Amino acid sequence: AAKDVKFGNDARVKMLRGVNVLADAVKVTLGPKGRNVVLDKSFGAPTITKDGVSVAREIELEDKFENMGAQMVKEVASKANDAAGDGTTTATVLAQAIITEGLKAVAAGMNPMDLKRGIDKAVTAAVEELKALSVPCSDSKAIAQVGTISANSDETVGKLIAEAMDKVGKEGVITVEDGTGLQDELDVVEGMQFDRGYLSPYFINKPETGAVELESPFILLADKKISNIREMLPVLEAVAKAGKPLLIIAEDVEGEALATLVVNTMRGIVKVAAVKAPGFGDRRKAMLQDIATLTGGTVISEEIGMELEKATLEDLGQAKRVVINKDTTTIIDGVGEEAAIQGRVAQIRQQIEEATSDYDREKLQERVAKLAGGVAVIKVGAATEVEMKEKKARVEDALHATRAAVEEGVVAGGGVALIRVASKLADLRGQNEDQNVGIKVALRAMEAPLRQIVLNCGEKPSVVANTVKGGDGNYGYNAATEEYGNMIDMGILDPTKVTRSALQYAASVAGLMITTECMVTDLP
Amino acid sequence: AAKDVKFGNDARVKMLRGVNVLADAVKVTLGPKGRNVVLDKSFGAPTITKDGVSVAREIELEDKFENMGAQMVKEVASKANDAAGDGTTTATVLAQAIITEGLKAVAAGMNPMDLKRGIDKAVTAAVEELKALSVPCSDSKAIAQVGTISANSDETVGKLIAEAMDKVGKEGVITVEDGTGLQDELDVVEGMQFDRGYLSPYFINKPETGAVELESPFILLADKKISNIREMLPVLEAVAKAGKPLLIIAEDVEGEALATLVVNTMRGIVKVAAVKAPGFGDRRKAMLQDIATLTGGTVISEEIGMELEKATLEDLGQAKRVVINKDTTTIIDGVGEEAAIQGRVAQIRQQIEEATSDYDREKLQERVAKLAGGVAVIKVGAATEVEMKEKKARVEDALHATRAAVEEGVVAGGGVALIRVASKLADLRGQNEDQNVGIKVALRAMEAPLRQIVLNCGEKPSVVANTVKGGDGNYGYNAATEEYGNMIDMGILDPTKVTRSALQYAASVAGLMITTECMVTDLP
Amino acid sequence: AAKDVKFGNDARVKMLRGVNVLADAVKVTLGPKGRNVVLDKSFGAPTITKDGVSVAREIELEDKFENMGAQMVKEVASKANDAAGDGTTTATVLAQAIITEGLKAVAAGMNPMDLKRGIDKAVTAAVEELKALSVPCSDSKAIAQVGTISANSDETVGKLIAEAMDKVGKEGVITVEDGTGLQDELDVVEGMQFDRGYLSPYFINKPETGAVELESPFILLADKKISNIREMLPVLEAVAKAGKPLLIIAEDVEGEALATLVVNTMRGIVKVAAVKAPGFGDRRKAMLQDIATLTGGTVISEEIGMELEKATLEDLGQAKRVVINKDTTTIIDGVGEEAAIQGRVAQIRQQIEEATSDYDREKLQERVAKLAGGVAVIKVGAATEVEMKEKKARVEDALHATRAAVEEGVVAGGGVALIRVASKLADLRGQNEDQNVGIKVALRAMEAPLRQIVLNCGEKPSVVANTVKGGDGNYGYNAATEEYGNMIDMGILDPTKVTRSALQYAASVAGLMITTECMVTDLP
């Protein structure tokens, strides 16, 4: 209804004022000597955590405007965590830095649209200047090493990851489950994974990772949109029986049907999750089939008079376990006949022998890959259930950091990678003085992460920063042992992919806000 | 109940005060160097946009009076966007201009009714002075060029549009859908399109374009008014089955029936949309038939004892897809027999051989056109679903700008077209000094758009405006490259139809408000 | 409950203060260069109108007393519009005038009861002095001319009306409907019209004219009062079927039954309207029959053991269309046998051959008139549905002004008719000085309308008024062209009946208020 509108300067300080709350609350956790943040929880005992991610999830101010501000950097900052499995707190302290001096420059009368381009340039450069500093990581001798460092130095984990990547390839699919006791197990099973996320949160039941998870569920494969539950009743209540959770894969689920389901998931009356079929066009229709074959059961496409009513229980698909993320569905262990699946790949290969194109070929040998590669399944084992649930956590995290180094390499941690990249671009300039400031602002900002880690350690930020800017390469400052040297050798590093992300993202929102002139929101 | 009434001057500042909030919030996006407006959204992360249309949709002030003011220019300013597919922000910043100086003049004691006529004259002239500046656009060499410029320079889009217009004519019917993969597809199908809009929003499900859309729906053709759902139950619940959405085309739908349906569309219990039959009189009755033939199925007219109860499922019409706008219904791909339809056109032509009139002839060869022309259907293709949904967006927009140039030509963009037309009418005068002011106010106002684009770019509005007023023709100022020259050659243009619209509309509301003496509204 | 009571002077300023809000808001439209009044509307875009009638409908103040004042002049001022189809804004600006100086005189210590009689005299005279200035209008050459002028000069309209009046007589019945395309149609159908209004608003569904309207409805003719719906159920739900709306004509409808129906009309569960049978006594009983014969079907009178239960569907009446006003029911096209009706008129004429009286004769040849005259039905035609709905509006209005001139002639418009009549009574006096003031107040007031029209045009009211008072006859001032001359010849006129009405009515309420000493209302 009635709205409140703020303009230019007025509207900007509100945002900043807002983001500061966010940034300051989250950054006291930066690296080693990070402090605790006490998050009060409805009923019970508070939660004491040093996890920047958890602290941010809760932050949400009262002033409608200040909130937007804080809410804005959160939207993006999380985008970095979803891409490299880390670097949210980082991206945030960065955006605070850019934004602060930036808006400062605007008040200084300079042009916004220029400060922006000047920033985007200083970044575009820092990213290439970062790919160069990036130390490769391809031999399984390194994988096993990164995975290790990314788990408080448990040489077991590192090894486990490696043995896995070795079975399915660096591009393979690796899954982590609970162990059946002491001793770890690993092996590949007929499975698959496509780039589709849950059609709505809530379905989530493991907020620890923010994902869905179903045991020996049913998979409904229907080529068509679904917005009316009235087509589900026959083959949905028949799933309340057997208690076997249900996964619906259709071209899409809308309104009535979707909402109706998002409801029942909290009301326990059947736990089902559904996601969009993969891809689009005729390929989507074909991939839907692949899934069906792989999981046994069939597709229900209108194209052939099939209706969601004339569908019994065997028409349905079934696998031993599925896992949905914000943007990834992965089916583990398919009932599909290890003989029928081998026959489907037969077709797909005799369809490449008729590849009257190049694009058409890749997309096809891309399908055999998924359908023939299978999925690696690591089962963490430990002495006690506790130790084990804990270890399974570390492995799940190491498995993430590892894949981010295998893709883009790793660089010096503790925030030095950025501070180095910054000192290397002092000569950089742009089209006009404003743009130059734009550059200088972004560069100045890249020191924030380090200067904060140091600060959290009751150090002298300036001394330590200048010192690190003095050396070259990955000469950093292990803030954990107050001793300078090579960061990679000391075991303090970050997947280049996360540092690059944190920076690109921070810079994105920073830019947008510096270029905002008007905010519209609801009246309190 | 009790109302609040303001008069003359008092009531006017309120309106102005209101429209200012609207105008200022929306104009900060004028020109490529436009800023962002952060629109807070109920629950979630804010929305950062530079789209003036979206910013206006949200604006709505608290003061009952100021609101009306803002609400008034929005009603009209959107009328411009609905006519040429663009130019809302423009029409708004224009109305602010006219209104500001106008009410200023009224306070100055001058007469309102005269300022008005003086304004309408200054416009009436600007419009003809604009048709002259208008560079034609008829050869498919130009269509393919305008369509291109109206899509960040994707020479593909421009070509696609052209190839289409070539198949159905400049007056043809062009539809855009999702592609079935990489590579674009184009072809004509038995379809039709009449000038009837949805009988109520809400039905809308693609607020991205503000239109309805149904897949392989059913079409109900009934010649009669419908206000009681009790006549639908038999043949409406029979449509809940098959899940196939339903389109009702009847002389009109009122109250009980209509409301009852507008309800169910949000409650997911069946997604149906209905619109008024085309035309009126006996012709409406005949056109209804055309539709029926074209979509297979029959009409239910009381004239022959038929009731909406004795109607099975085959009596109903059916097509592969429909699309309703604020004022346009378009049926795509009709089940109708490509042989029966050819027989209907038979009659309509042997009915022209009995055309004892002229009017009667045009209206008939106007029907064969719709029923025999068919509909062109472009299917945008791309590498990934994302790229594709994006491209389909660009094509949909380029397909709009194109038709607005094919109708009335194109003129220099960046607001110069107006500023030129203005400098050309400095000699213009009216019946008295007031009317002269009226002229001078409108002229002065026509510089707003340009002066703002410039201002958004941190320029010196005056210098740049005078320079542009110095040259002649389409000598403008590409604000994107700070370099003057010919606007059309630089690729900066606007369909004459949108510039004309924005102006005529802005002037309309400006006029009304300047001539308002009393406002009546509810008490808070 | 608890009430608030004001007395004499105190209570009067409150009313005046109130009526001033009404008058000032509405008069800013009165004639030509009239201004706009923006009426805010709940949800949506405001309404900009110059229609005094619409502006008044909304006005309603907060102060309980001031409201009464404004609410009082509205009650009457509308009485004038219902009598001559125009002259509400006029009657209002008139009442303001009388009341202002009147109450001014009261404070001046003069007597109220005398100011009144002095005013009523000044009016009684102006009315006769007005019948004399009235230019006749009887030859269809004039009808066709007045109808024309009363429609922005569309010589088609004027002609249409005339061709109609020619078929049914000046006292005939003329109906206006939508056309079946281009070209107008006119013809008489077996119909009738009596002086009974709707038994309650709400039934209304065409607030554009403030009337009811039913298509091919059913007519229930029952001689008896009806307050219990329990007698309707059998023959009312049987009408929910067929969907055919129902018109109930009974001696009267009260409470339970009535309310119950007024409810359902908004709840769409059946759209029925009912009105009182015409006349009273035995004649009412007989006229009820006439209707029945004319519309086929029969009357249900208790006098012969008939009950509203033992009534099927054929016992009911039926016509092709009905239209109810605030005080007029008119049945159009009756199913009645064009042969049976001719037989009823047979009786009624052989009943005049036994007319042992004079009164008895007239009332009878007054019935054949209605039952044998039929109804003229004009079907406006146009190029497009829009143009047509618009034209049908103009015809509907012209058809009103025409009948008001045919009855009492026409006089000079633009408010001169009154100002002339006023300058002709300067010599008039009464029984005492107070009454004389009473006179002088009314005369002074009769200049308001003109002085305002002039004022709205940014003129000098005094100069223009004195000039017009100088001349004689219909020498007026066409405020549209600032040129004096003969008003009738210039085409600026008003049916004498409306000017007479506006005046008599304004004077009525003005009188009442000047003579009020106490106001009682509810406590806020």
Swiss-Prot record, chains A, B, C:
Any one GO MF annotation of this record: isomerase activity
Intracellular or extracellular location(s): Cytoplasm
Residues that bear N6-succinyllysine: 33, 50, 116, 276, 320, 389
Modification after translation: Phosphorylated reversibly during heat shock. Can be UMPylated on a tyrosine residue by SelO/YdiU, probably under stress conditions.
The keyword Hydrolase is assigned to this record: no
Activity regulation summary: During the substrate-folding cycle, the two GroEL rings separate for effective substrate binding and chaperonin activity. Ring separation is triggered by ATP binding to the trans ring of the asymmetric GroEL:GroES complex and avoids formation of functionally impaired symmetric GroEL:GroES2 complexes. Activity of the GroEL-GroES chaperonin complex requires Mg-ATP. UMPylation of the chaperone by SelO/YdiU negatively regulates its activity, and may facilitate survival under stress conditions.
Residues the record lists as N6-acetyllysine modifications: 116
GO-annotated biological processes: chaperone cofactor-dependent protein refolding; protein folding; protein refolding; response to heat; response to radiation; virion assembly
Any single GO CC term annotated in Swiss-Prot or TrEMBL for this entry: membrane
Enzyme Commission number: 5.6.1.7
InterPro entries named in the record: Chaperonin_Cpn60_CS, Cpn60/GroEL, Cpn60/GroEL/TCP-1, GroEL-like_apical_dom_sf, GROEL-like_equatorial_sf, TCP-1-like_intermed_sf
Pfam family, one: Cpn60_TCP1
Residues engaged in binding ATP: 29-32, 50, 86-90, 414, 478-480, 494
Catalytic reaction(s) noted: ATP + H2O + a folded polypeptide = ADP + phosphate + an unfolded polypeptide
Top-level division of the source organism's lineage: Bacteria
SUPFAM superfamilies reported in the protein's UniProt record: GroEL apical domain-like (SSF52029), GroEL equatorial domain-like (SSF48592), GroEL-intermediate domain like (SSF54849)
Keyword vocabulary terms for this entry: Acetylation, ATP-binding, Chaperone, Cytoplasm, Isomerase, Nucleotide-binding
SUBUNIT field: Forms a cylinder of 14 subunits composed of two heptameric rings stacked back-to-back. Interacts with the co-chaperonin GroES. Can form asymmetrical complexes, composed of one GroEL and one GroES, and symmetrical complexes, formed between one GroEL and two GroES oligomers. The asymmetrical complex is the functional unit. It was suggested that the symmetric heterooligomer may represent a transient intermediate in the chaperonin protein folding cycle.
HAMAP family per the UniProt record, alphabetical: CH60
Cited PANTHER family: 60 KDA HEAT SHOCK PROTEIN, MITOCHONDRIAL (PTHR45633)
This protein's domain notes: Each subunit is composed of an apical domain that binds non-folded proteins and GroES, an intermediate domain and an equatorial domain that binds ATP and is involved in inter-ring interactions. Forms a large central channel that appears to traverse the entire length of the cylinder with no obstruction. The central channel of GroEL functions as two cavities, one in each ring, that are separated from each other by the crystallographically disordered 23-amino-acid C-terminal segments of the seven subunits. The entry and exit of polypeptide seem to be restricted to the apical end of each ring.
Family: Belongs to the chaperonin (HSP60) family.
Function: Together with its co-chaperonin GroES, plays an essential role in assisting protein folding. The GroEL-GroES system forms a nano-cage that allows encapsulation of the non-native substrate proteins and provides a physical environment optimized to promote and accelerate protein folding, probably by preventing aggregation and by entropically destabilizing folding intermediates.
The protein's name in its UniProt record: Chaperonin GroEL
Gene for this chain: groEL
